[PDB]
Symmetry: C3
Subunit: 116 residues, 3 copies
């Protein structure tokens, strides 16, 4: 899984253990090994929602599978509660997009996943 979390909260408000904790959360919920999860964090960024600059996170989650309709309900509930607990965001200021990828469209260790 490859996750990007962007927020307009400052970098000092996104704790240093955020990526590690999010890596544990997605490992368990997506059944993926920790060494196949990458997390990008972009804090202090300009972001609006409804043109408001109130605190918000916009997250992208890519994975090869593990993204059925029902799995995404569960990942959304978990990531949303996690951002509430760690970033203090309201439950309605966490916007997530999922991308279910084929292994032909992922490169790792110098070739595609499909070709590994």
């Amino acid at each position: 899984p490859m996750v990007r979390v962007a927020t307009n909260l400052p970098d000092k408000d996104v704790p240093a253990n955020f990526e590690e904790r999010l890596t544990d959360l997605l490992a368990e919920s997506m059944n993926k090994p920790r060494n196949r999860i990458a997390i990008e964090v972009l804090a202090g960024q300009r972001i609006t929602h409804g043109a408001s600059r109130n605190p918000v996170a916009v997250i992208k989650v890519e994975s090869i599978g593990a993204l059925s309709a029902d799995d995404n309900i569960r990942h959304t509930q978990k990531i949303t509660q996690f951002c509430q607990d760690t970033l203090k965001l309201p439950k309605d200021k966490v916007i997530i997009t999922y991308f279910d990828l084929q292994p032909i469209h992922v490169g790792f260790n110098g070739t595609t996943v499909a070709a590994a």
Copy 2:
């Protein structure tokens, strides 16, 4: 809609009202509510186009629908004109990718849009 606008123009050159005006523009062009529109702006960034560092914008627009072939002609005309007016970019310096999402792949308010 979840929109990301990246530019090599300095942050001081993307006016504070950019997100507001672009929110209004996309609400009208996509027939989407203002409170379902998020805009990320990333200025001051390293970007090249044909390896040139001349001013350019690279924009991603995600939406659940409202992205037909015909719709996308209208969004591109409107966004490209808006970047020309506000950022002074040439008409051939605004690069846009559209992602038409299913509602099972968007998380908002703690569950998927499909499950809401």
Copy 3:
């Protein structure tokens, strides 16, 4: 092609010719014109892989075709080698996602590529 290279390596460590040389690399690999290749470089960013902050690059490659299964093996080999050479990254610290776009989802010069 529209390529995003994010890395936790500092900006001073990503050479000023990085984008020139990647633009040549992608033009030859994908058989796409140099003036249809944009690259975004986001260095100095928070990234973990397996929760490690060791040096890593997370890259997204979007293209109107040229991303067959076999094509993606070649692009992964070349881009991974290229990051080993220029950024001093290990082979297993280069994570790539490919997105194969329809021309109705790409806006350039004020209209879609499909409608050019």
